[PDB]
Nucleic acid binder design. Structure first.
Length: 266
DNA sequence: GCTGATGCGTCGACGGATCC
DNA sequence: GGATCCGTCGATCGCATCAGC
């Protein structure tokens, strides 16, 4: 079935207006994404903070369009020492920025919350890297738990797992596939329990099917909405009263993932 | 400098078997 | 004998390096 994301809810459950708009996007090659007008879409979305995954670009090769973003002028980039890579771009300067826990994680502390963006390792075709993914999950959980700040956490990005059967179109046939193994699903559950965190989208839309953020380029999967929900905003419990909406920007092209957008009343 | 071949990381369609 | 379950296989894209001119 096709999916139509509901309209943006910009007011919190207690009636407060959103003050902060965060967008996350696995861009499948930043340079290619820019050529496919991805930055035009970012400008229309006008987030306060933009998190990017799979940049496949070292800082010295960032296209010139990226220094024409006056509303996203504080930019931090991390790559493995033309694969992987993540970026964080922000209207206001963060207080602190750090990298790692490999070019997969950026941590940025703001006035009232800590933002982590991640590009979680893929278990691989034939699960050849599943054990590494499980060891990585465990190290990542411990890292997030051990964050020194008492500030609440927003974790966003491509977490490379569809948590539950409702998070992908073909759950039965994919239970031995990267992104839907019982091992990866379990690690996501432990992340939520251990940190702790809530899945913003699922909190608001607990029974909504066919809501995905990734479609394989093969077999015209996106045209059929045969997809997976791999990209998330996970929030500390204390931020739920501030949660206004968690969006899936299904129509935004340029990658095999679509953007996701969070509105918080802070 | 530029193109194209190749390598690497990144599952839905399909055929067959089992169940009642 | 329709529904379901399971294992197999070809395949999109972006970026790298390499060979050639």
């Amino acid at each position: 079935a096709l999916y139509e994301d509901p309209p943006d809810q910009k007011t919190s459950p207690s009636g407060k207006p959103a003050t902060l708009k965060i967008c996350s996007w696995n861009v499948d090659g930043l340079r290619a994404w820019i050529k496919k007008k991805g930055l035009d879409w970012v400008k229309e979305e006008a987030p306060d903070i933009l998190c990017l995954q799979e940049t496949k670009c070292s800082e010295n090769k960032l296209p010139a369009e990226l220094q024409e973003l006056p509303g996203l002028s504080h930019q931090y980039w991390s790559a493995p020492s033309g694969y992987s890579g993540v970026g964080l771009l922000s209207r206001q300067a963060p207080l602190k920025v750090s990298y790692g826990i490999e070019g997969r994680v950026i941590v940025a502390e703001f006035d009232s919350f800590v933002l982590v963006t991640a590009y979680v390792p893929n278990a691989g075709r034939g699960l050849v890297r599943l054990e590494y993914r499980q060891r990585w999950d465990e190290a990542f959980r411990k890292f997030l738990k051990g964050l020194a700040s008492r500030k609440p956490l927003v974790l966003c990005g491509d977490l490379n797992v569809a948590h539950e059967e409702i998070d992908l179109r073909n759950p039965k046939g994919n239970k031995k596939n990267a992104g839907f193994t019982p091992q990866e699903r379990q690690g996501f559950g432990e992340l939520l329990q251990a940190v702790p965190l809530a899945d913003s989208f699922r909190h608001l839309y607990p029974n909504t099917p066919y809501a995905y953020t990734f479609w394989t380029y093969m077999m015209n999967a996106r045209s059929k909405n045969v997809g997976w929900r791999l990209d998330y905003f996970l929030l500390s419990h204390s931020l739920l009263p501030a949660l206004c909406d968690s969006k899936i920007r299904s129509k935004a092209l340029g990658s095999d993932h679509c953007p996701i957008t969070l509105y918080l009343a802070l």
